[PDB]
Amino acid sequence: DELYRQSLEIISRYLREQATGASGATSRKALETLRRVGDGVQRNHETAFQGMLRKLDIKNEDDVKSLSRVMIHVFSDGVTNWGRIVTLISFGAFVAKHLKTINQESCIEPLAESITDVLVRTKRDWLVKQRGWDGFVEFFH
Amino acid sequence: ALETLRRVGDGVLRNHLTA
Structure with missing residues (x-):
């Protein structure tokens, strides 16, 4: 609820910012941390990511809602860490770029909302226990 | 589905x- 609102803001802003452009304190350092690491x-895996984008293929919002079920499976090996969290958000900013390249900038927020759902609604336990976004900021010192 | 996000992650x- 409050974890979700913050999470969404941080994530929406990052995906929207990375789209050819540019209410809390922790949200401040978070976005900057997310800028650097994020x-x-993408640079470090500009090819590995493109390989996912292709084998997934993404034209409409029906696709975007399917990439949701993919991300939810990311944490299936019972393994949860900041590397995976940030990589998911990174791939989202990547998928948000390919989203506007095809004029569908309208699918970006749904994507941001989708990414947040995973973290907040399916990983609230680990997230809460890991000092939320503060822990994210702290970890990626 | 696609679990390579794990590998990169x-x-x-x-x-x-470790840096």
């Missing part, structure tokens, strides 16, 4:  | 906690 991941 | 983690 941009890094 | 777990990889990005490890490469940070």
